[PDB]
């Protein structure tokens, strides 16, 4: 199938019409998404088949065809771009300065941008265009608005 680097929509026909359940990143021949999007199911790329290789429900991450490749980190200071890919709509950069998820195991980047759940898997970039993590695992706050972690995996 198509193994050009870039961002891709994750679609299903198991419901009415063709439905976008999420987004993902192709890099170095590996496809990267969020576990809650695919549930670790295989994927089609034309005639090509993509088999899961690594995943973890707690990180809510999954890689296809190879190990996790994305190792760039939010620097803790600079603004970032959410390369959002919403259902039925074209790819759109949105610049923001991330907030902070404070946890017992450490502090994580967070972006306060609200988009349909089908946007889950859209990447977040540094000023050099490197992927520092994926969008779509987070929390609903006092206001009723959505805040997402900058979810990054470990490269071996």
């Amino acid at each position: 199938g198509e193994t050009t680097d870039g961002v891709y929509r994750v679609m299903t026909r198991r419901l009415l019409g063709s439905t976008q359940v999420g987004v993902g990143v192709m890099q170095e021949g590996v496809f990267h998404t969020m576990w809650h999007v695919t549930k670790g199911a295989a994927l089609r790329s034309g005639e090509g088949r993509l088999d899961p290789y690594w995943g973890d429900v707690k990180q809510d991450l999954v890689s296809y065809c190879g190990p996790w490749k994305l190792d760039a980190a939010w620097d803790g200071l600079s603004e970032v771009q959410l390369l959002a890919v919403p259902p039925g709509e074209r790819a759109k950069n949105i610049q923001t300065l991330p907030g902070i998820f404070k946890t017992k195991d450490g502090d994580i980047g967070a972006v306060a941008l609200d988009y349909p759940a089908g946007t889950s898997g859209s990447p977040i970039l540094d000023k050099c265009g490197r992927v520092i993590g994926l969008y779509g695992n987070g929390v609903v706050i006092k206001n009723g608005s959505y805040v997402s972690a900058i979810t990054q995996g470990k490269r071996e």
């Binding site: 050009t4 870039g6 994750v10 994927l43 771009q81 390369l83 404070k102």
Partner: protein
Amino acid sequence: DMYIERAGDITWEKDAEVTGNSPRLDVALDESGDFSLVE
């Protein structure tokens, strides 16, 4: 059965729409990978 379609390049776009705030949030992460507000 699920399939992928390409939707763009991964590029920093100068003078993109600038928006969103920057909250500091106390959160817990459970074994199911669901975040929650530690209040």
